[PDB]
Symmetry: C5
Subunit: 212 residues, 5 copies
């Protein structure tokens, strides 16, 4: 349809893509997790596999437009390949991430973006004691791989992981799940790097479907 095609052409076909954030022009990315399933634990390797949706939000001036000039369009869907996306990376993964959903973002006229890819990830986690009442706790940090806090900052809208889509008949049940902004330093570099620490306490489900 005509106005949207016009908008996309104007946004994407007449300027260099945004070169990412800088010290002079930093960016804050909002992160939120929807934990869908703990699929698998491996006690011989201390890896656990999660399926989650990773909600990402940020805003770029270069993605702004006046809806009046585009038939009142206030937002649109577009392939995530058409726009800059933050290098938010799980820091304790053991396998490359597996993408389970289309990668398509929603862009709004004020230059804000929402992007929520579904992912399966194997990560470092010792599941010893998962078949007990107390269960086990594991944690996983997410943050920019390459940008320090001087270029990319992070925040969560809530410290409570969204569990409203958690698979009720998973082999594992969630005792608690939080997502908390933290600061980290790595050996390579003097500067502070921001992460969101996903902390999940869980155990083998012993009630519900399959259990009598």
């Amino acid at each position: 349809q005509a106005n949207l095609m016009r908008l996309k052409s104007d946004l994407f076909n007449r300027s260099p893509m945004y070169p990412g954030p800088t010290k002079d022009d930093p960016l804050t990315v909002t992160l939120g997790f929807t934990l869908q399933d703990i699929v698998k634990v491996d006690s011989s390797t201390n890896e656990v596999d999660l399926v989650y949706w990773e909600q990402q939000r940020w805003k770029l001036n270069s993605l702004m437009w006046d809806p009046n000039e585009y038939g009142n369009i206030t937002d649109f869907r577009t392939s995530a390949a058409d726009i800059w996306t933050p290098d938010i990376t799980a820091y304790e993964s053991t396998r490359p991430v597996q993408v389970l959903s289309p990668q398509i973002a929603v862009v709004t006229h004020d230059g804000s973006v929402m992007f929520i890819p579904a992912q399966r990830l194997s990560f470092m986690c010792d599941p010893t004691g998962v078949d007990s009442e107390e269960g086990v706790t594991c944690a996983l940090t997410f943050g920019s791989w390459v940008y320090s806090g001087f270029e990319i900052d992070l925040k969560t809208d809530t410290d409570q992981v969204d569990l409203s889509s958690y698979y009720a008949s998973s082999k594992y049940e969630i005792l608690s799940a939080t997502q908390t902004r933290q600061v980290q330093h790595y050996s390579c570099c003097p500067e502070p790097y921001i992460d969101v620490n996903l902390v999940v306490k869980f155990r083998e489900r012993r009630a519900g479907n399959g259990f009598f």
Copy 2:
């Protein structure tokens, strides 16, 4: 041949591709499933693997042509990469979908499209009790990942899953399989999203071929 070459050049060379549906120009996608095989169950991870053909139909004004101007061509096969396709997604997969067939669509002169890829998918399903007379029931929802009901609506032509190509010597026999349109909300967003709920009841095959 010559006329088809002209038609494909005229449709695919001279205009921007359809930017997807919008609130002002929504799209209805028709879905239907042909369930070919339940291949595997995993009771240590509560994952089940299906092979199915997913029939998708939709119509675009931008894909219309006058057959009179193209040697009376009324339809053609074309690579799915050549056209917009809907982002219909299984919401409870645990691995990336595996495509088992070419991805080629049929486009008709009225702009309607038929596209039927074969896929293998692992999804969240507790198979406990599958080896019993009563079997087990699992459900899997399919819908747009990024578009609400305001942009993409779904429908089925029948609520019965097509079982006429179901593998007769599968480990698992199908007791029932339905596909039903429904409405869902996710935490990220306040708008209604539409899905098709695929509900399959099954058990270990204990009769037929290989059972004397």
Copy 3:
């Protein structure tokens, strides 16, 4: 090299690619299978894994040239991606096909093409009884995914599957294997679709002292 470079340039840079067959201009694809190895059976999922070569042949007028104009070149090898290839698909696979060879076709001056990829495929097959004298029978159909018999017809040169390269120390011995043209229908469409039915009878190979 020079003559061949000119031929490939002239064939592939001057006109749109063949858009595939139509009712007005159908195409017949010849298929033949060489079974190399039954690698694995899985009795917990009823899947069997085969390694085979699939010989495909067809002919397109748009691939014709006069050898006199190209230093008497009568055929050439080229990447299969440079030409149209038919969408011949195993209908009962359970995993994406794994290609084990380069995908390069031979094109002949009369427009005929030969293309023989090596593939490993997992497919739907109940292996119960494979460890018995009678063994087991499994079948796999191959045909176009999207074209009916009005656009793509199939044929074989023989109904005898080529077993001359079958791995002799396989876990499984082949009793027989046939490849036969058939007509099939599927729910989506009312038109006849053509396939080649590959039927393999096999059993465990237990005897062998190297």
Copy 4:
């Protein structure tokens, strides 16, 4: 922003890419390892799986700029695909490396580059005796695949592998881990080749988190 866009355009859009080092113009690559986890040992195949971050540094004249001409920009992040990178290779791997992080480098105005990809690698290692107090030692060499020491020299900044991020609840604990420059020869060619020898001594962890 504007100045960075100018800089990237100038560096990347007007000259052929650096064609790699030569005898006349050799390059020294500094290497360092951050060992994050020994994930798995396979005693039936003598393969061991590591997760590590591989820190690579080098300097090119062609990547220099005057910060004064570019709004006082002194460094920037850019996709590793935008620049030449060294073909540093694990010589005893048994599976293709799996990349676990974005591949983005930092380029500084003096032409220096820092690139630190996270990787999972299976390599040749006999883990017999890992379950004892003395543990086992394995070695893995890293070097250019195709350049001799006439074109690529290697250096470490320290002979101590960085263990500050080692996963505390790994199945395996590290007894020692060193990284040492060496000079090796291969049958194909007569020239001196340079490697970095990663030597890890480790055993099954039987103390700490998960142990009471």
Copy 5:
């Protein structure tokens, strides 16, 4: 530096790529193997996994240059994607080959090319008896997939497989390894095809690393 950029531009930016050999202009490809490890045997499927480096050499007139015109450059490294490469294929593989090294070749001013990728391959091999003194023998043939002996003449410089980099603590020790040229015919075609037969006799390693 400057001279190499000139050379690569001159070689790669003006003429069509070599279209492969023909009967009128056949090509000799020299093959040699460096056997690094027998990683795994599978007695359930009769597959064995090897790691080897496959040394390939051939010469093209179109890759020649006068060193005098290019600052005395007599050879250079270049991505294998920049040049034509022969379709040398393992004939009894059971999985797609996995590449373990960069794919970069060395081109010399006389037009000759050296290219040595490291690979892991699963192939057809019955390992029954590998745990004995006499061990077991398996053979794997390599040759062009599509070119007969009239287009590609395969040669070896030696029938001795290079064992100088064989992993000393492999599960399997090598008793002998030879590489032998032979003529094959395939049912499809009347022409002779040339292959190299890699024949490896091996057994379970019962002495070496530890083996106290």
